[model samples]
Target: RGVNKVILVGNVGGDPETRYMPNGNAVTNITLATSESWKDQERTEWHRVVFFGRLAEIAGEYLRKGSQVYVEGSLRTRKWQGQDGQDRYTTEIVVDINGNMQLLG
Candidate 1:
């Protein structure tokens, strides 16, 4: 319903973890770090980025630590059960195959 777009241009924190499903669907997971350096203060924010289908395969092969990227996607919140039997939640930027993504220098 409302606008839920997110545009992030940051550096990758680590290599992408990619796996395939039984149905041959590929998913890639990566972390991007954004920093706020205003007023000489150093602060960093880590974002979870997810790619699906063809994008996932490309991301897995190309993205790596310290690589800069520009991504445009929507935020997704998922809930799961923790090891302690408690409910855990995580937020990720879900990028579809058609979503906008660019590798930057």
Candidate 2:
């Protein structure tokens, strides 16, 4: 009965890549890096975030490597075929038309 939401505030790993679908929709993919500290140690985690349609265009235009960003979306796991003919699975945060994303300081 609740939502499958995820919120992330981190630095972008690289420039956002925006691609278009055959039906003229836009899709953008970007990686985010987050770090945590414990007992004088630091651990960094990477996340894959995706934006669709108008958000896709916005992300492509404003986000870049090292940019700070705030994103709110849902986690999704999908399966695809690899070049080696293997079934590959990946989990990513999906920022669809209803999701939220923004550039931060």
Candidate 3:
């Protein structure tokens, strides 16, 4: 997908929202402002990166707010239901140190 693929370049709202699962895998969440603005003009988009191992370590150290990075990964839509029983959908890139993922400044 070097020639044709979805590329996201944006800022982090804050340090990556990361957590450790019961299995000790680290999950990092990000909200991306893939445009020139946010909400009103160039609304920001949200992204999640569930880093698995050493990648997660690296991400936690350097990924911070206001820093820019070109996120390369596959797009995915997450579907879930709310307490109201309505379906919710969110699309994001999974940059978990996969062979195709690249987070660069």
Candidate 4:
């Protein structure tokens, strides 16, 4: 038996901070840095991901800069209007709190 999922091993680019919503739910946001190196391309790329809810709590509690983490979750996209009145879209891997992430020294 199998299920749909995605796993990423990367470093935390910054500290995980939490914000409380009006409804009292906590939302945690952090950047996950993942890079790929290739001779053919000779370039590296980075990715920033945002997590929410209980997953955010775990991130705020343990994730930090240069900390390695294994994130397992499904992809989600959010769209909203920017300050300039333009639409912006963001995609992220929303992790399940039941999933565990190992911190490597």
- Ordered from best to worst lDDT, the candidate numbers read 2, 1, 4, 3
Deviation in angstroms for 59 in model 3?
1.7
Sort by TM-score, best first: 1, 2, 4, 3
Best by TM-score: 1
Least accurate 10 contiguous residues by lDDT in model 1: 34-43
Stretches > 4 Å off in candidate 4: 1-4, 22-25, 40-45, 98-100
Give the alpha carbon lDDT tens digit for every residue of 9-88 in model 1: 99999989999999999999999999987782789999999989888888899998999999888999999999999999
Residue ranges of candidate 3 with Cα displaced over 4 Å = 1-5, 36-52, 99-105
Most accurate candidate by lDDT:
2
Question: If scored against the real structure, what TM-score would every candidate get?
Answer: 0.91, 0.90, 0.70, 0.72
Off by over 4 Å in 1: none
Task: Count clashes in each candidate, considering only residues at least 3 apart in sequence or on different chains.
Answer: 0, 0, 0, 0
TM-score-wise, the better of 1 and 4 is 1
Off by over 4 Å in 2: 83-86
**For candidate 3, lDDT tens digit of each residue in 7-65?**
67777777777778898887667666665554626545565544555566656677888
